[model samples]
Target: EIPLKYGATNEGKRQDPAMQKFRDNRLGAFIHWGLYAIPGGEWNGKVYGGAAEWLKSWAKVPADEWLKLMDQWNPTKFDAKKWAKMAKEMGTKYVKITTKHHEGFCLWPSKYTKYTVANTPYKRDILGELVKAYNDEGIDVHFYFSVMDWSNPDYRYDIKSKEDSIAFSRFLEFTDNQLKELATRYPTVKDFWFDGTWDASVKKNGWWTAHAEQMLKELVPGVAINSRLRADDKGKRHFDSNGRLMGDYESGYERRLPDPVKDLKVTQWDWEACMTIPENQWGYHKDWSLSYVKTPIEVIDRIVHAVSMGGNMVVNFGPQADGDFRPEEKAMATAIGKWMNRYGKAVYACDYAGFEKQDWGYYTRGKNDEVYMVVFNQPYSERLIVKTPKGITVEKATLLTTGEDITVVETTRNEYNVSVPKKNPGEPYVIQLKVRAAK
Candidate 1:
């Protein structure tokens, strides 16, 4: 079993304001825009059925050949303000843009790397523009960085000799230089979501990875990092021998999360789950028929599911070549945004309600001590049975959408039968309950 580390550098304490802000965000958006978006998983006029972002590895395209795609990086429809406005309308408090992916292509113009946007026709700082625009919209911005550079020749799976150390050390320096540039240039960045660090080369340099987190935090106060950036002597994912999580929150939940109720294993940590509209695709792909794509309702259900479990959910968006989102993605965002606009209080700045598992659906709590019972499955008897935990008593129940009173019958000290309204709300209906503090 992996000895879970509380916090690697700060002794498991919330000393950084940025980390606190990250936990407070509760909801955010993730953008996987890159050179891959241009091809959208198509090669030789045939679309491959996989996540477009991982096309380089899936299709076995060499770094040199892949970098050539930057020549076509013009996004005629990409307006930073429009994207930020869309995020605001969707109720996302922060947005994480991929600065670099596993292919080692840098979106920002890095002085240490020639394979960057500065060398292409669309020679503008994509990340810089995004940061400024998102901040102006009162939304926090974060960077998604990949430490495993497939383009770098020095990257090795297993070190064989002293020469390997020298080569790997140089690679670390390159990563450090790029991160320093970003931290110094874009001080508004709130967090760094590290990915692509699962390579053997990254495992060997785990100490350096931990050090990189420390360096970034020092460079920009309150800027948080992710757990994927850490490694130990045993090739572990996060923490060192002393049992400390390297970053501000756990970052391994890409498409999964724990139960909606408290699980002791995850109580001491913070985590967020990032999900795709399609079952597997993350980047824009030419073929949507190859995978099972989730509808807007499905996406909204998952978002509420995460918030009910006391975790953040980041929905990914892959803009098309001309800088416009696919029709399906745009539609999903609009529908989900409408639902959030009405019952968002059940999610934003919310925590997990202290309720055990039931078939009714998930549960979330507001800061005002009101518990939101999200009933996804309407009971067969047309009535929902909920055993409220001790300490809080249900005073009144109200529908979040129509502000209409809901009939709540208290059957026992911890049991209640809540009747549904005459008409169903179509989406997950929130049963807001006013209760006294736990005695």
Candidate 2:
């Protein structure tokens, strides 16, 4: 390993109670709201097909012209309680709000910058209200902050000249101030997931990223951070030169996941995956028909897939400029909430069951000796193939929703042919198993 500073802060998965709770809060949702929501991915009567949040870049809108969107930022329909209630009903334990996205729009009213909600028409502490409302509903809130600023002139993609270095230095200081302000203002926030840190300028100033993580920790005791925010002394992101995760949790899984079979590097991995409901869209796009949209069933499949592999998953939502979600998004949330209300026993506070992947679906281990088999595909033989680890026996199997005992027959050594439910639930269902290990 190279001898240098600004490497991983923690050796492995954190064991403290707070960190443990973060892991247990397996399913989360993302709120990607910003100036980009106003135009909804259109520029000069021409629509863009890229991620709507990056519309400013795709549309080639000048910085001054883009910042002018702040004038039209009036979300009269936005109510903090209603938003929090939706999250509560959606079965998300936490909500990751965009405190600031790549467009350099600030959700909160910060005294340090004139380009904040304080300058907008609907001038109110949106961030503060969200923190309170979400926390009130017993749901954790995480801030999604982007270090790169498009509106700021001091921002540099790559510091090549003396003036560039000076301006970039000032920009880092400003970021530190804004981060400090967020921590100070919303002390209840549980985590910070940093984005837009892929530029050469950020990688070179790796020390600042390290400092930012430490600063937030100092301000908000027990606060967690994503590994994507950290860049080591050698400019290595996420993992260090010696293979150590820099931040609290790995944040590399974006719009994709580690394979269940080939990429089952289980014990060594503790990561979080976030995906957009519509293909490759994180912000509101007026034309969702441009790409395939994911149904609620598909979303549920991903949630189980991540948790079954000892990782967490967050579904993204893009609210419209009117501060309300599109009909599709609202319906998506409602569908998830209903399923969670019934089968959430298998998703929440669950970890990887350490079982070999089967053709039927995923396996998640909850508290005690409880293991859940969430079935997406039913076999024609009427038996769910279950191969338990060596020295373990499937003591009993029962349907999770109805609590009805299902048959479990030991077909071979450490292998069991767990019978599927008699009446097909017509939807993805969970089968809870009680297991025992040899002494």
Candidate 3:
């Protein structure tokens, strides 16, 4: 077992109270709203048909060309209260919003740059408003800030010469100014989920990255940063060759998770998996026909899968240009809200129980020493085969939905197949196993 903190006995798992609070906030909603949402992947009568958020880069539009799209940044229907209410109803403990993306468009009025919401027709501090609204609703707010700015002329892809170093140094200072503005402006921000730092320019300047990390930590105590904001001599994203994790948790798992049996790399540290409702649309794409959108059930299954592996799953929502959710997204949020309302105990404050893959489904351990068997596929035999690992004994079992007793048959010394009721529990049901210390 990887001791909670390398080799220190005093370093317990989630020892810091702030980190404990973060861990307790297991479920969160990710909001990717910006000027990109206005276009929704259409430019001058041509829909590029790629992910809408990256339309600027995907279309190779210059910074000035992209900034002109601000003429349509009118979120007439944008209701911060409604959005916060939706998240609250969905039972998300926190909400993460992209304050700035690769396009360098600031949701708030950053004194460091002119490309902010203050210059737009919707002249409101969107990020500030969101922090207030979410905090009022008792939800922690996380800011997704992109370090790679296409809008800045000083941005360098490589420092091949002294000229490049001179230009890049200026770019770094500009970024520092913007970060300082954000840190001071939004003191209520709980975490900084940095993105778009994978470029060669930022990676080559390792000292700058280190400096930014230290600066942010100094500005805000107990603020968490992701692993994407670091690099080594080789310029990798997560870890260096020396095994030093650059940030608080791993943030590389996008639309994927490590296989519990095959991949043990993530088992030792905290990680988050952010997935889009559609295949690649992180921003609101008007043309849903181009992508295969995930149904609510599929989304919930992914959440359970992530929690089963001791990781948090962030589901993305891209509001339309009018600042209202699409019908499909609203339906999804409502469905997930319904599911989470009843079976949330299995999702929140749960841990990896080290269960092997089986036809019954995944296993999630609860805080109260209950093992929740999330059954996705009910066996035709009406018996769910759940084998026990050595040194544990099951005392009782109950269906979380109906609260009815389920029979536990110990077929072997280290194995038992639970025979659930003949009547299947319509949706994915949780079978809570009350285990006692094996004699």
TM-score of each: 0.94, 0.99, 0.95
**What are the lDDT scores of the predictions, listed in order?**
0.80, 0.91, 0.82
For this target, which candidate reaches the highest lDDT against the unseen true structure?
2
RMSD of each: 2.3, 0.9, 3.2
Q: 1-439, model 1: which lDDT tens digit per residue?
A: 4453322655554645666678668888889888898888987666778789888877888889988898888887878898888888888899999998877888899998888878888788888888988999999998999887877887766678899888988988998999999999898888888887887777766677777888997898878787888777666776666666666777756666675555635646677789888888877887889878888777777888877776778999888878888888778778877888888889888877777667888778887788898888888787888787777677888888778898889888888888887797776778888776674
lDDT of 3 by residue, 98-155 (tens): 9988888999998888999999898989888889899999999988988888888888
> With candidate 2 superimposed using the best TM-score fit, by how many Å does residue 16's alpha carbon deviate from the native?
0.9
Candidate 3 Cα lDDT to native: 0.82
For TM-score, the strongest prediction is 2
Q: Over the stretch 1-439, how does candidate 2's per-residue lDDT look in tens digits?
A: 6776899868768888889888899999999988999999999999999989999999898999999999999999999999999999999999999999988889999877888998989999889999999999999999999998998899999989999999999999899889999999999989999998999999998898899999999999999999999999889998888888889998866767888988877447578899889989998899999999999999999999999988888999999999988999999999999999999988898888889999999999998869999999989999999998988888899999888999998888878899989999899999999998898
Provide the global lDDT of candidate 2 against the true structure.
0.91
